[PDB]
Design an enzyme around this catalytic site. Structure first.
Site, mmCIF file in Angstrom:
data_model
loop_
_atom_site.group_PDB
_atom_site.id
_atom_site.type_symbol
_atom_site.label_atom_id
_atom_site.label_comp_id
_atom_site.label_asym_id
_atom_site.label_seq_id
_atom_site.Cartn_x
_atom_site.Cartn_y
_atom_site.Cartn_z
ATOM 1 N N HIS A 165 40.729 -62.832 23.895
ATOM 2 C CA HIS A 165 41.561 -62.040 24.762
ATOM 3 C C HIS A 165 42.945 -62.739 24.915
ATOM 4 O O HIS A 165 43.883 -62.134 25.423
ATOM 5 C CB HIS A 165 40.872 -61.831 26.120
ATOM 6 C CG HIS A 165 41.589 -60.881 27.042
ATOM 7 N ND1 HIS A 165 42.418 -61.324 28.059
ATOM 8 C CD2 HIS A 165 41.588 -59.512 27.118
ATOM 9 C CE1 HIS A 165 42.886 -60.269 28.728
ATOM 10 N NE2 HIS A 165 42.426 -59.161 28.159
ATOM 11 N N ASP A 197 53.950 -55.609 32.892
ATOM 12 C CA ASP A 197 53.271 -56.785 32.426
ATOM 13 C C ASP A 197 54.332 -57.895 32.266
ATOM 14 O O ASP A 197 55.571 -57.625 32.310
ATOM 15 C CB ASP A 197 52.599 -56.439 31.086
ATOM 16 C CG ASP A 197 51.374 -57.282 30.793
ATOM 17 O OD1 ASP A 197 51.276 -58.373 31.348
ATOM 18 O OD2 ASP A 197 50.513 -56.881 29.977
ATOM 19 N N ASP A 464 40.558 -67.131 26.614
ATOM 20 C CA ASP A 464 41.824 -66.838 27.233
ATOM 21 C C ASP A 464 42.664 -68.088 27.274
ATOM 22 O O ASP A 464 42.166 -69.201 26.953
ATOM 23 C CB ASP A 464 41.660 -66.249 28.625
ATOM 24 C CG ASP A 464 41.585 -64.712 28.615
ATOM 25 O OD1 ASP A 464 42.480 -64.049 28.049
ATOM 26 O OD2 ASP A 464 40.630 -64.144 29.211
#
Length: 501
Positions: A165, A197, A464
């Site tokens: 991710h 974002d 991540d």
């Protein structure tokens, strides 16, 4: 100049995962927040960056993002390392890569390029690695014979729902762009209702840390390409799979300082890459608090698994970033809670740390994606709650558990929490009638230290990665450019938790 927030976080990572120091996390000095000249806040790559306008006419954020990505890649001499969540980057994301790669070849270089995406077991890839490889070679035209490509999609655990991710763009192990932005043209670029974002751009020793992290993922990916259920791999022209591209590029030339910003790089290996840090002495008290709304079927790696922590230090990094707040904390996320089942609905330890701050009179602001955004991931799904009460009720519960009495719990909750769903203008939704989708993974503390990266605060067991920066000057920019404007418009969607004045 001192770093009381980073020092607390570092203490907690060396305790959690000392064996992963230098590959999955690493503290470094001498970084630069990589702003273009005459645009001092230009390290902050927000998108769309059209505050105050429901029609979003001037996307200065998007433009700056695409430009920075193109330029970092155009400067490549040796290596370009890209990670994302499938589908593979398309539209302008993809043009930025192709144009930056053509510029690099035109200056006489032969860059090695790794592109890694994670894919959910249920997610059918329209463009598989070999097709994406051939597409890039085609757009590269003649530049192509100078570019070595490894392209891979991967799933590390079907059972435990783990895949990549992280969203990284590392060039020459010396510049890095990371944050929440997937390279998906329909969500971010070609739409009258763009996802909001943020990424950040940096250069310096902390970009080498990001390269080490990607090397770790590529070591696993190259080895597991013997299992096509786990890895699909396409390379250009007989090129080997390159597990250690970044290590090979770093040789040994201790990373050069480019500035004065201290940074902690911190990621996680999800499930299926490494079981534990055998080196780690970590032995926490895990919490024991059943959830009333949802009982998870899966083994709960977020709340109830010691070993998972040791290979996912980012979980503790974030918990102890929040725990280090002395005065105030701002959280800006897609969600704090996850879809349950299959996952636990929340991170108990995170809610406790927040409850603890609320009790101590630390100001806490949570801004999340508007619940109207509920839906499938990759297809416009940017919320996992039906109402904001799902956040304030959990906090009440933990405050009650923590303070003993329900009156104190209400003092702390009503006096110290701001909770709202995100907006970027005075309108309640985009001028086209779609609600605002928020995809930030941002936490800022005391106007000194902040996290930007790809790690959500809601339970998820993925690979991540992100950066924690401590710098008042940078925090001040973040405050001005993003947090203040966010709150100016989102306060009109503030929730009053049940039981408050």
């Amino acid at each position: 100049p001192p770093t009381p927030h980073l020092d607390a976080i570092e203490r907690s990572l060396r305790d959690t995962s000392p064996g992963l120091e230098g590959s999955v996390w690493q503290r470094t000095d001498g970084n630069r927040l990589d702003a273009p000249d005459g645009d001092p806040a230009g390290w902050l790559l927000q998108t769309p960056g059209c505050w105050g306008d429901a029609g979003c006419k001037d996307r200065a954020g998007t433009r700056r993002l695409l430009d920075k990505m193109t330029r970092n890649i155009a400067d490549a001499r040796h290596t370009v390392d890209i990670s994302s969540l499938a589908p593979f980057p398309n539209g302008g994301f993809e043009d930025a890569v192709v144009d930056g790669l053509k510029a690099s070849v035109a200056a006489g270089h032969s860059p090695r390029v790794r592109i890694l995406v994670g894919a959910a077991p249920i997610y059918h890839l329209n463009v598989v690695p070999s097709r994406y490889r051939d597409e890039l070679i085609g757009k590269l035209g003649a530049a192509a014979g100078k570019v070595t490509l490894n392209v891979a999609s991967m799933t590390t655990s079907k059972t435990s729902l783990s895949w990549n991710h992280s969203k990284l763009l590392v060039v020459d192990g010396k510049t890095a762009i990371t944050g929440g932005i997937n390279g998906w043209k329909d969500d971010y670029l070609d739409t009258a209702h763009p996802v909001s974002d943020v990424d950040m751009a940096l250069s310096g020793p902390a970009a080498r840390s990001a390269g080490k992290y990607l090397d770790t993922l590529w070591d696993w990916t190259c080895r597991n390409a013997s299992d096509p259920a786990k890895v699909w791999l396409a390379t250009s022209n007989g090129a080997s799979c390159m597990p250690s591209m970044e290590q090979d590029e770093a040789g040994s030339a201790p990373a050069e300082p480019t500035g004065d910003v201290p940074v902690i790089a911190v990621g996680g290996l999800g499930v299926g890459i490494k079981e534990s840090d055998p080196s780690s002495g970590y032995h926490p008290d895990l919490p024991t608090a059943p959830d009333t709304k949802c009982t998870v079927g899966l083994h709960d790696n977020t709340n109830a698994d010691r070993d998972y922590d040791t290979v996912n230090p980012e979980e503790n990094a974030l918990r102890s970033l929040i725990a280090s707040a002395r005065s105030h904390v701002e959280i800006s996320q897609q969600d704090l809670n996850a879809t349950c089942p299959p996952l636990p609905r929340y991170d108990i330890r995170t809610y406790d740390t927040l409850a603890g701050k609320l009790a101590a009179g630390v100001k806490v602001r949570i801004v999340v994606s508007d619940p109207a955004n509920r839906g499938a991931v990759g297809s416009g799904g940017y919320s996992q709650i039906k109402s904001l009460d799902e956040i304030s009720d959990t906090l009440r519960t933990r405050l009650v558990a923590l303070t003993g009495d329900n009156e104190k719990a209400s003092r702390a909750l009503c006096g110290n929490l701001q909770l709202a769903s995100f907006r970027s203008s005075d309108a309640a939704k985009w001028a086209d009638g779609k609600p605002y989708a928020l995809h930030h993974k941002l936490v800022s503390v005391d106007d000194s230290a902040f996290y930007i990266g790809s790690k959500n605060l809601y339970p998820a067991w993925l690979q991540d990665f992100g950066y924690i920066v401590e710098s008042p000057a940078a925090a001040q920019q973040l405050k001005t450019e993003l947090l203040d404007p966010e709150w100016k418009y989102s306060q009109q969607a503030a929730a009053t938790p049940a039981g408050c004045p």
